[PDB]
Amino acid sequence: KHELPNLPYAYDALEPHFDKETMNIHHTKHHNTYITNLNAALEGHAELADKSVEELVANLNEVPEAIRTAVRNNGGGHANHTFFWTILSPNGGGQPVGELATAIEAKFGSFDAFKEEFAKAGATRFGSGWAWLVVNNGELEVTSTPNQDSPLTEGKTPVIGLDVWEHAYYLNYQNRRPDYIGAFWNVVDWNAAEKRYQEA
Amino acid sequence: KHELPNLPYAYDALEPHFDKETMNIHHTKHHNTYITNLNAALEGHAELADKSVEELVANLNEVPEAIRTAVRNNGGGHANHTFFWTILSPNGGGQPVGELATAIEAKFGSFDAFKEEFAKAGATRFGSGWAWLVVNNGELEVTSTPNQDSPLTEGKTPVIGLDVWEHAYYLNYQNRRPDYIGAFWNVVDWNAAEKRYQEA
Ligand SMILES: [Mn+2]
Ligand SMILES: [Mn+2]
């Protein structure tokens, strides 16, 4: 009973920053496959299967050992991509807004300095993974995670994030990960980010 | 000190199985960058910069802690890719040959059974990595390693291997990793593999 969410915008709405071919394959093949595999691993655990994917992944510890890796990886994939689609927008880009903006200035010095730290976290994540701005204390932290591991599992709440698996950027940027991260700034939705900051 | 090896064949020599655009970017951008990063890391360590990259990665524990992660990832990348180019050929494909062929039949039952097990290791390596046929103390085994980790580090000797980082396959295959693994059977060089088996 885990379903693929529709995108909040057209498949070409993030162009030229994120290409429509990637949006299609990333959403309808990669994300869908995580869902397929999650639902299979949850066959026989109908009790577990009625949690939200976010709660499921936050309390990975309580998943039966037999299916834990499958939940970590595929539950991770579902939680992470679900989040991702909703922090992007064709009306995104620009400066941070709201109390999140003020908090970024305080924690990082400035928005430019934050962007730098986030881009370094993204560039430095060796292999597959994600770069994040999270709330831990009630404090902002830049982090990165391997594969489909989620900050939620560490008790940290995602405010924004960027998929740095090669499938996310290879068609448009090839090995140019930094150019991809640069493009993300033009589509990240700071209104949505504010909500996530406030809602945590 | 460490230098990018030329390919043993033209950039389009593995078509249609491995595309020439990928061969270009994979060799001259990805592999080159591991070498740049490795050389930067070994600045100030004469001890090490006399070692082969295979010696460095076999004895990773003897690398000073301050540069060990860099040598693991970039040393691993250089050793792994150097090896990879040498086990591919436009005169590749077909059935195993030599003493290796006999050993594969004995260990796995048949070549087809071996391919199935290798294909499964490759498909199931979650995130970035490599699938391998190695010799472990005189015995054939199929394994997989994350990121640029090498079997050498665990005292196992690679006979064949396949790069399952998405950069190795995304341009021609997108999410269809199993189809890429299929295509590898047509360019793997079993004469070259026989020689590695003999020397291991
Ligand atoms: Mn992804
Ligand atoms: Mn590679």
From Swiss-Prot, chains A, B:
Record has Cell division as a keyword: no
Q: Which residues form the signal peptide?
A: none
Q: Which cofactor does it need?
A: Mn(2+)
The entry sums up its family as follows:
Belongs to the iron/manganese superoxide dismutase family.
Enzyme class per UniProt: oxidoreductase
Q: Name one GO cellular component term.
A: cytoplasm
- Keyword set for this entry? Manganese, Metal-binding, Oxidoreductase
EC numbers for this chain: 1.15.1.1
Protein name stated in the entry:
Superoxide dismutase [Mn] 1
Organism per entry? Bacillus anthracis
Pfam families named in the record: Sod_Fe_C (PF02777), Sod_Fe_N (PF00081)
- Catalysed reactions, as listed in the record: 2 superoxide + 2 H(+) = H2O2 + O2
**Cofactor remark:** Binds 1 Mn(2+) ion per subunit.
Give the matching InterPro entries: Mn/Fe_SOD, Mn/Fe_SOD_BS, Mn/Fe_SOD_C, Mn/Fe_SOD_N, Mn/Fe_SOD_N_sf, SOD_C_sf
Q: Which SUPFAM superfamilies match?
A: Fe,Mn superoxide dismutase (SOD), C-terminal domain (SSF54719), Fe,Mn superoxide dismutase (SOD), N-terminal domain (SSF46609)
Its function, per the record, reads: Destroys superoxide anion radicals which are normally produced within the cells and which are toxic to biological systems.
Oligomeric form and interacting partners: Homodimer.
Flavoprotein is among the record's keywords: no
- GO MF annotation terms: metal ion binding; superoxide dismutase activity
Where does this protein hold Mn(2+)? 26, 81, 163, 167
From what superkingdom does this record's organism come? Bacteria
Q: What is the lineage of its organism?
A: Bacteria, Bacillati, Bacillota, Bacilli, Bacillales
